[PDB]
Amino acid sequence: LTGTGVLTESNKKFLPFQQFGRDIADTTDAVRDPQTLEILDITPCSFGGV
């Protein structure tokens, strides 16, 4: 799952079987880390129109 974003710890209470979360646009929006098994938030890095 290649992608550009800020990673953080989250309030996303994943159930024990869940590996990912998604937005409406199908884009992944949280991930379980495959080594430390914690539930990372993904936010696309701070952006806006100029």
Ligand X SMILES: *[C@@H]1O[C@H](CO)[C@@H](O)[C@H](O)[C@H]1NC(C)=O
DSSP states of 22-38? E-TTS-EEEEE-TTT--
Residue window 3-42: x/- pattern of binding to ligand X, with contact defined by CB under 6 A? ----------x---------------------x-------
* Total of residues contacting ligand X (CB under 6 A): 2
The answer to whether residue 42 forms part of the interface with another protein (CB under 8 A) is: no
Contact by Cβ (8 Å): 30, 42: yes
The answer to whether residue 13 forms part of the interface with another protein (CB under 8 A) is: yes
- Cα–Cα distance for residue pair 1/31, rounded to 1 Å: 9
Residues lying near ligand X in the complex (CB under 6 A) are found at 13, 35
